[PDB]
Nucleic acid binder design. Structure first.
Ligand SMILES: Nc1nc2c(ncn2[C@@H]2O[C@H](COP(=O)(O)OP(=O)(O)OP(=O)(O)O)C[C@H]2O)c(=O)[nH]1
Ligand SMILES: Nc1nc2c(ncn2[C@@H]2O[C@H](COP(=O)(O)OP(=O)(O)OP(=O)(O)O)C[C@H]2O)c(=O)[nH]1
Ligand SMILES: [Mg+2]
Ligand SMILES: [Mg+2]
Length: 862
DNA sequence: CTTCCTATAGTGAGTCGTATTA
DNA sequence: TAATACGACTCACT
């Protein structure tokens, strides 16, 4: 390991020496400096900005040590937070916070004082340790190198995109150790809060508020950034200038993996990376000794995927985002969102002010979301304008306990349209014909044209030619590209399809082409049992037409809608003539007879029968569809004036769900049956056992354990947290008692462990198929670039073909020699359950559909 | 039971009883 | 001595 081997005096030397060694030197320094950028503000970097962080940063810095006095002078006990806040350079303590705080804020969802603090406290610890190493490394990567100019130049402009090396030369000094927080979540809270606390005193940046008090279930405290700053983030460009996510790209090939920790970043002065983001220590420790070469090589290749900033897009990106009315509504405007003032009168509770409590909160619920999506945008935009030039930039990868592959950089190619459109590769090659074709294809996919045969897609392109004959020239005028489902990503194409015609099929192209199936997981299910209609629905079959699984269930459910629209039942009795009004909720259970008549009045298309579908891969039944169909289509409908027919909503919601669950239950029959099967295994395999009365017991609730195709092990270990609260006199005002979970539990939550065993095993696959994919595709068709998004594996226009094919070749080959369902069993037959065994088997019946029919499946790429 | 994972996480004022320090 | 900062416990919560 790193430590125990050499004294910290040099642990910060090896990384730099080795770095400067390959690649270059100029780029070597900027690297660890960059990595450092996620801990403390550059003394020089700062003096260079001569606008926003500039103001907040110092005010905070001061307050930090300034607070250390107030505490040092006082007698009595000292605020715990302090106890470990002192031995830490304040110039960092402040910086972390701002960012880390601004970071969390970018989450329109969880902004609860819990999260932030977690996020802050973590970093602080991430600096508490690696203290000197984080510093001494600087004094080191500061001094020049050992002579040499030529080879020290950095790359000699040699356009060859330097490739990383191997564990060989890799000095044992560059590894990883305990990448898990050593502090107790309890204390980690004291720190952040206190940080936050002092961030408030110093800078008013963000304020804390009591969200929906007295609400025993939805009661919590969150921090909402102050307007001032918010306002100077939509207008004042580069506002977050010096602000950079605690994780940024790299302008050099990343440090290859070979262990549970020790990858992505080089700088041994920071926090190590976890190959598998495990919600625990032990879980990750299991992954130590695995002997799973296929897993590593896979990620190693993905990580070594060089990226370039789409200089053209950016050019317009940061431009329009500052327009009062941007052609992209997906962009949080800069204008202020008013609201319907008090409804004429004042003291009334009919349906006006009664519903006003929910007719006015929309703005109080949206002003919070906008600021989110905006703070986010400004982030991706800074990094862009930041690396805009950088020759090449890599993204480090990680994977959840399930396998799925995530990029570590917050500015990952796995983000929104803006973000993706602003990315591209570099090792491109003269697209040629094969590519040009798919290029025009990718244009359509993005153009929202994914419901038709390729021939009709390409057609779509040639048809809208002149539509681009000016879009790529003066987009600032050609507001057409900003209409397609993904304008940004589309534009990127508009800029290629334009030049490809200015240079010919010789026109090199680095733009990655995206390939996404019809409905992942559901595709894999129909693959491990061969659901005849299943694959045919998830387009997995060599169909001649685009089978919209979502749309089939529409007409399908629509069919049953006409049924109950003729007979069904009838408006059941109210709830009047009774004893003493025991239950007056809904004085009419209505009937399926009039229900269909309401739906047929709304339309019911693929829309409604959408979410409820995919979600099925996560565990969505008729119970769940109620809420979905409601808030997704019913609830909002009426909250817009329409939906004037839905007299009793909740009921109608129970109606469609009903219809829905049916329509699919018989379609993707394999999926459900499979899940129910899985969902059945866990239970009697998760819940402990006892004995013939008395009380004695034997088998202890074993943690889910099985192995993926490529070899990636995995455990569910869905333990049950043991929470508690703290007492914190926040800002000498009140007492903030945080309810937090203790990262030292041991108990396990069966229930969940159950409802999750199935839906997880899914991704585990469609996330494992992927690895094998890229690997095979690497050695098979010598591929290097991969713009994969869990199920959207992409590559250069020329590597399209090999990819488009390779995916199948794996999906098949894999679910062929391998038997997920079966294998899983063998993974516990004896290891897990002992006696009984029975009243649980009932293997799922297989279907007749040779997987080779996939190698030719035109659609359903994934 | 009732929508996976990029992890999470009911709140604050009363009232006390302890180590801990200037 | 006498002043801190807080875990522990317990209610009522629009
Ligand atoms: N694992 C996972 N991936 C998701 C989920 N939602 C979307 N994705 C994938 O990540 C991609 C981008 O996700 P986000 O950046 O989180 O959402 P978004 O698509 O930008 O939505 P919006 O434009 O309205 O901001 C799109 C898709 O490939 C999700 O819940 N889980
Ligand atoms: N794990 C997970 N993945 C999601 C979730 N929502 C979306 N995704 C992933 O991101 C993908 C985005 O799909 P959409 O573009 O929203 O729909 P679609 O099914 O592709 O069909 P279409 O574009 O024609 O409407 C689908 C899926 O693989 C989610 O809640 N959880
Ligand atoms: Mg979203
Ligand atoms: Mg998809």
């Amino acid at each position: 390991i790193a430590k125990n081997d050499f004294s910290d005096i040099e642990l910060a030397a090896i990384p730099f020496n080795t770095l400067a060694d390959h690649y270059g030197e100029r780029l070597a320094r900027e690297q660890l400096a960059l990595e450092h950028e996620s801990y403390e503000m550059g003394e020089a970097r700062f003096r260079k900005m001569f606008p926003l962080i500039t103001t907040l940063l110092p005010k905070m810095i001061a307050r930090i040590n300034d607070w250390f006095e107030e505490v040092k002078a006082k007698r009595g006990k000292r605020p715990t937070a302090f106890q470990f806040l002192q031995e830490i350079k304040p110039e960092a303590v402040a910086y972390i916070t701002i960012k880390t705080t601004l970071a969390c804020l970018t989450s329109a969802d969880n902004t609860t004082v819990q999260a932030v603090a977690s996020a802050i406290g973590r970093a602080i610890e991430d600096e508490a340790r690696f203290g000197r190493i984080r510093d001494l490394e600087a004094k080191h990567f500061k001094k020049n190198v050992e002579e040499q100019l030529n080879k020290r130049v950095g790359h000699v402009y040699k356009k060859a995109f330097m490739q990383v090396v191997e564990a060989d030369m890799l000095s044992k000094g560059l590894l990883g150790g305990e990448a898990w927080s050593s502090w107790h979540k309890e204390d980690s809270i004291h720190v952040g809060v206190r940080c936050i606390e002092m961030l408030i005193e110093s800078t008013g940046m963000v304020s804390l508020h009591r969200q929906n008090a007295g609400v025993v279930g939805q009661d919590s405290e969150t921090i909402e950034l102050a307007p001032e700053y918010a306002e100077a983030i939509a207008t004042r460009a580069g506002a977050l200038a010096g602000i950079s996510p605690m994780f940024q790209p790299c302008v050099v090939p990343p440090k290859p993996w070979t262990g549970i920790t020790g990858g992505g970043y080089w700088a041994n002065g920071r926090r190590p990376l976890a190959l598998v983001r495990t919600h625990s220590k032990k879980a990750l420790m299991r992954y130590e000794d695995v002997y799973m070469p296929e897993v590593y090589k896979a990620i190693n290749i993905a990580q070594n995927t060089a990226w370039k900033i789409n200089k053209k897009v950016l050019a317009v990106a940061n431009v329009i985002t500052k327009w009062k009315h941007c052609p992209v509504e997906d962009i949080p405007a800069i204008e202020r969102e008013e609201l319907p003032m008090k409804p004429e009168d004042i003291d009334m509770n009919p349906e006006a002010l009664t519903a006003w409590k929910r007719a006015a909160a929309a703005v109080y619920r949206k002003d919070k979301a906008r600021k989110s999506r905006r703070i986010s945008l400004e982030f991706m935009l800074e990094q862009a304008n930041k690396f805009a030039n950088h020759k090449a930039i890599w993204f480090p990868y990680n994977m959840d306990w399930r396998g799925r592959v995530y990029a570590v950089s917050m500015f990952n190619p796995q983000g929104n349209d803006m973000t993706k459109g602003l990315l591209t590769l570099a090792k491109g090659k003269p697209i040629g014909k094969e590519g040009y074709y798919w290029l025009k294809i990718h244009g359509a996919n993005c153009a929202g044209v994914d419901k038709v045969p390729f021939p009709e897609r390409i057609k779509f392109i040639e048809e809208n030619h002149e539509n681009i004959m000016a879009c790529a020239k003066s987009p600032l005028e050609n507001t057409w590209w900003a209409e397609q489902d993904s304008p940004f990503c589309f534009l990127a194409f508009c800029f290629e399809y334009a030049g490809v015609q200015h240079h010919g099929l010789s026109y090199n192209c680095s733009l990655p082409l995206a390939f996404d199936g019809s409905c992942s997981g559901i595709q894999h299910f129909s693959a491990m049992l061969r659901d005849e209609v299943g694959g045919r629905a998830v387009n997995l079959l060599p169909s001649e037409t685009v089978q919209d699984i979502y749309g089939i269930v529409a007409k399908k459910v629509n069919e049953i809608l006409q049924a109950d629209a003729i007979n069904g039942t009838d408006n059941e009795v109210v709830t009047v003539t009774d004893e003493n009004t025991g239950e007056i909720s809904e004085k009419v259970k209505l009937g399926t007879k009039a229900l269909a008549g309401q739906w047929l009045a709304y339309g019911v298309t693929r829309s409604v029968t959408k979410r409820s579908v995919m979600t099925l891969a996560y565990g969505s039944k008729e119970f769940g569809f109620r809420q979905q169909v409601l808030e997704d289509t019913i609830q909002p409908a009426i909250d817009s004036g329409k939906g004037l027919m839905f007299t009793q909503p909740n009921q109608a919601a129970g109606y469609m769900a009903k219809l829905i669950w049916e329509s699919v239950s018989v379609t993707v029959v394999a999926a459900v049956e499979a899940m129910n099967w899985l969902k059945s295994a866990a239970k009697l395999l998760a819940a402990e056992v006892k004995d013939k009365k008395t009380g004695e017991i034997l088998r202890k609730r074993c943690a889910v354990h099985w192995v993926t195709p490529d070899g990636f092990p995995v455990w569910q270990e869905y333990k049950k947290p043991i929470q508690t609260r703290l007492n914190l006199m926040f800002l000498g005002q009140f007492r903030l008692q945080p309810t937090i979970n203790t990262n030292k539990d041991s108990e396990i939550d069966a229930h969940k462990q159950e409802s999750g065993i199935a839906p997880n095993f899914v991704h585990s696959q469609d996330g494992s198929h992927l690895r094998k994919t890229v690997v095979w595709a690497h050695e098979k068709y010598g591929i290097e670039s991969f713009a994969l998004i869990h199920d959207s594996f992409g590559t250069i226009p020329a590597d399209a073909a090999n990819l488009f094919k390779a995916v199948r070749e794996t999906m098949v080959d894999t679910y062929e020699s391998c038997d997920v369902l079966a294998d899983f069993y063998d993974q516990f037959a004896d290891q897990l359950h002992e006696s009984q065994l029975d009243k649980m088997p009932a293997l799922p019946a297989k279907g007749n559909l040779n997987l080779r029919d996939i190698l030719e499946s035109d659609f359903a790429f994934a």
